Structure formats: structure tokens, C-alpha cells
Design a protein around this ligand. Structure first.
Ligand SMILES: *C/C=C(C)/C=C/C=C(C)/C=C/C1=C(C)CCCC1(C)C
Ligand SMILES: CCCCCCCC/C=C\CCCCCCCC(=O)O
Ligand SMILES: CCCCCCCC/C=C\CCCCCCCC(=O)O
Ligand SMILES: CCCCCCCC/C=C\CCCCCCCC(=O)O
Ligand SMILES: CCCCCCCC/C=C\CCCCCCCC(=O)O
Ligand SMILES: CCCCCCCC/C=C\CCCCCCCC(=O)O
Ligand SMILES: [Cl-]
Ligand SMILES: [Cl-]
Length: 264
């Protein structure tokens, strides 16, 4: 059981959540068209990093669209407020989606870091195992956000341990392979690390909202934090990854990338 089910919502709270989720869909699908069109300017070595941004945009866009429809299915305006009907709304579906989206985000970073062969395969496997441990333990913890806050906290601590180990793998790989990067992207990639540290830390903050703001305004805050975090961790991040891919492509002599950069 999730905290959303405990409350009735004002028309203001209900409509704001619907608009946040709907705006989220729009931003991700608008970004998808950008990544699709610029993929032709990326060298073959990096083209999979731009394709992964397209995959993340549709995956995230579809979960946000699903959440928006589930939100409107679950509530109806009755006696002056939006009240729970027969259908349920939950954040559980986002956790399931992270099982696919987090590995995609991590893989596109490894590609632009110029990792290849055995090092790429072994780094991706450890990263994906750490990401899955984080997601599964978090998914279990949030099943107790109404019934048992102590259990939410302890599964949250286990999940945070996987998060910290994953961030150490990411940081280690970034600061080690920064020197292999072309066209000044050795500087850009350090900003990508900090963007990840910031954006990804908003998810455990949203996870703890039932512990510090268990009310209808807390429900709104959690959807707002997921909105900021999704746009930063998927869209802004994807735009930086694509910039890095095109810049390294042009530095390596890929003529469509040089022509695209020269045109802007
Ligand atoms: C596009 C979606 C992304 C980048 C999701 C990232 C999710 C996390 C970094 C989740 C982390 C969590 C903890 C560190 C503790 C509480 C449980 C989680 C799973 C919310
Ligand atoms: C990268 C940042 C992306 C985030 C964009 C989201 C912008 C819109 C967010 C907040 C505006 C504040 C709206 C006021 C909330 C009204 C409270 C209520 O529900 O009654
Ligand atoms: C119904 C939802 C409303 C639709 C939202 C459409 C607005 C799209 C605006 C921004 C999305 C960001 C797309 C990223 C392209 C990068 C642009 C750039 O080069 O700076
Ligand atoms: C609406 C969406 C239509 C998007 C189709 C754009 C095709 C991209 C052209 C290309 O670069 O191959
Ligand atoms: C892999 C998972 C490893 C360790 C997680 C176990 C510790 C958290 C269990 C909490 C269960 C409970 O509170 O009853
Ligand atoms: C107000 C501040 C809002 C800023 C939000 C960031 C927006 C878009 C990020 C796009 C990243 C592009 C990479 C920069 C390339 C470069 O170093 O010149
Ligand atoms: Cl190539
Ligand atoms: Cl997602």
C-alpha cells in the first residue's frame, strides 16, 4: 500500500499532478525527435549512445503516460474533492521501469567514455548488477511506506549502499577514462558525473517523502521531485551524452559530425 491511496485531493492538487505527468510525456517525446534526427551526425563508434537516448525517451515517456492515465482512472470528483475509485495508483511501476532505463543510461556513458571489449562488458555487468540491487531493494522498501516506516528505512539503507557502490564505479570510470576523450569532452564528462550525482539523489529523497511529509501535499512533492529528476537524469543527461558523442565524432574525423557542428 502506497501513501497516495490515503488521501482525497483538492481539484488543484489533482490537476497539478496530472499536468506534471502530461508535461513529462511531452518533454520526453519532443526530446526523442531531437535524438533521432541528430543520430545521423554521430560516428558509428558512438551511434548506440544516441540510440539509447531514444530508447530511454520512449521508455520514460510511456511510464509517465501510463502513470497519467492511472492517476485519472483512480480518482473522480465526488462531493467537492477527487476521491479514490476502484482502480489504484502507485509508484511501483516506475521502479519496474528503472530495471531497463538505468542500465541504458549507464551504457550510454560507458560508450562515450571509449570503453570497449572485455572492459566494457565487465564494467556494464557490475554496474547493472549494482543498479538492479538498488532498484529491487528500493521496490521492496516502498511496499512498506504506509504499514511500516522502519522497514522502508532499512530497505532504503540497503538500497543506498548499492547506490553508493554504483556511483563509485561510475566516478572511477569517468575520472580514469577522461584522458582518452577527444575534442575537449574530457572537461564535459566531469559535468556529466556531477549532473548524475545531483539528479539521481532526488530519487531517494522522493522515496523518503512518506517519512517526513505523509499528507496530500507530500504526494504532490514526490511527483514534482520525480519530474525534476526524470528531466535532469534522462533528457538533460541525454543531451550532454549526445553533445559528447558528436564532438568526439568530429574530432575523430567523421565528416557528417564536422558539417553538423560547423552549421551551428
Ligand atoms: C531515469 C530514472 C533514474 C535515473 C532512476 C534512478 C533511481 C535511483 C538513483 C533510485 C535510488 C533509490 C535509493 C538510493 C534509495 C531508496 C530507494 C531508490 C530505489 C528510490
Ligand atoms: C529541470 C526542471 C524541470 C521541472 C519543471 C517543473 C516546473 C513546474 C513546477 C512547479 C511550479 C509550482 C506550482 C505550484 C504548485 C501548486 C500547489 C498545489 O498543488 O496546490
Ligand atoms: C502535452 C505536453 C506539452 C508538450 C511539451 C512540448 C514542449 C517541448 C519543449 C522542450 C523539450 C526538450 C526537447 C529537447 C531538445 C533540445 C533543444 C535544444 O537544442 O536546446
Ligand atoms: C511526428 C514525428 C515524425 C518524425 C519523423 C522524423 C524522421 C527523421 C528523419 C531521419 O533523420 O531519418
Ligand atoms: C541482497 C539483499 C541483502 C540484504 C538486505 C537484507 C536487509 C534488509 C531486510 C529487511 C527485512 C525486514 O525488515 O523484515
Ligand atoms: C536556468 C538554467 C537551466 C539550464 C538547464 C540545462 C539545459 C540544457 C543542457 C544541455 C547540455 C548541452 C551541453 C553543453 C555543451 C557545451 O559544453 O557547450
Ligand atoms: Cl566509428
Ligand atoms: Cl524510467
Amino acid at each position: 500500500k502506497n501513501i497516495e491511496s490515503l488521501f482525497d485531493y483538492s481539484a488543484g492538487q489533482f490537476e497539478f499532478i496530472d499536468h506534471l505527468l502530461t508535461m513529462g510525456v511531452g518533454v520526453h517525446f519532443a526530446a526523442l525527435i531531437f535524438f533521432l534526427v541528430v543520430s545521423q551526425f554521430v560516428a558509428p563508434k558512438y551511434r548506440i549512445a544516441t540510440a539509447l537516448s531514444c530508447i530511454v525517451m520512449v521508455s520514460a515517456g510511456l511510464i509517465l503516460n501510463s502513470q497519467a492515465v492511472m492517476w485519472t482512472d483512480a480518482y473522480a470528483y465526488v462531493d467537492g474533492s477527487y476521491q479514490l475509485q476502484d482502480l489504484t495508483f502507485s509508484n511501483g511501476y516506475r521502479y519496474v521501469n528503472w530495471m531497463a532505463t538505468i542500465p541504458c543510461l549507464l551504457l550510454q556513458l560507458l560508450i562515450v567514455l571509449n570503453l570497449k571489449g572485455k572492459e566494457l562488458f565487465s564494467t556494464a555487468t557490475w554496474l547493472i548488477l549494482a543498479a538492479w540491487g538498488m532498484i529491487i531493494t528500493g521496490y521492496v522498501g516502498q511496499l512498506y511506506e504506509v504499514d511500516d516506516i522502519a522497514q522502508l528505512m532499512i530497505w532504503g539503507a540497503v538500497s543506498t549502499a548499492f547506490f553508493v557502490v554504483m556511483n563509485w564505479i561510475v566516478g572511477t570510470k569517468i575520472f580514469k577514462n577522461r584522458a582518452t576523450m577527444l575534442g575537449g569532452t574530457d572537461s564535459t564528462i566531469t559535468k556529466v558525473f556531477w549532473l548524475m550525482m545531483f539528479a539521481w539523489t532526488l530519487y531517494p529523497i522522493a522515496y523518503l517523502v512518506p517519512a517526513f511529509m505523509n499528507n496530500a501535499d507530500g504526494v504532490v512533492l514526490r511527483q514534482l521531485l520525480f519530474t525534476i529528476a526524470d528531466i535532469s537524469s534522462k533528457v538533460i543527461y541525454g543531451l550532454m551524452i549526445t553533445y559528447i558523442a558528436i564532438q568526439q565524432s568530429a574530432a575523430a574525423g567523421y565528416v557528417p559530425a564536422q558539417q553538423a557542428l560547423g552549421r551551428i
